[PDB]
Amino acid sequence: MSEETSTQILKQVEYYFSDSNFPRDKFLRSEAAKNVDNYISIDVIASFNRMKTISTDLQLITEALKKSTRLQVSEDGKMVRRLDPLPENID
Numbered sequence: 001m002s003e004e005t006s007t008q009i010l011k012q013v014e015y016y017f018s019d020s021n022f023p024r025d026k027f028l029r030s031e032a033a034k035n036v037d038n039y040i041s042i043d044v045i046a047s048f049n050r051m052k053t054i055s056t057d058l059q060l061i062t063e064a065l066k067k068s069t070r071l072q073v074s075e076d077g078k079m080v081r082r083l084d085p086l087p088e089n090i091d
Helices: 002-018 024-031 040-046 050-055 058-066
Strands: 070-071 081-082
Touching: 002 050, 002 058, 002 070, 024 040, 040 050, 040 058, 050 058, 058 070
Parallel strands: none
Antiparallel strands: 070 081
């Protein structure tokens, strides 16, 4: 719980972008395609399977996004955008 599990998930969320896996996984890319990579519903991120398991609750998924490391979640908590520059061994 707390910053351990929140941070686990935080790494895990950015990791899907960091592992150059967004452009590959049309699951991500379908959502990203609403605004390049500035629109990512928490429906997709909750539905990421691995994320749902590590979180066990959408509460933890929502906090993880609220504390995003190299992403920024909107105040609506239904979009997040990542950084222009590629991530380099980020955790």
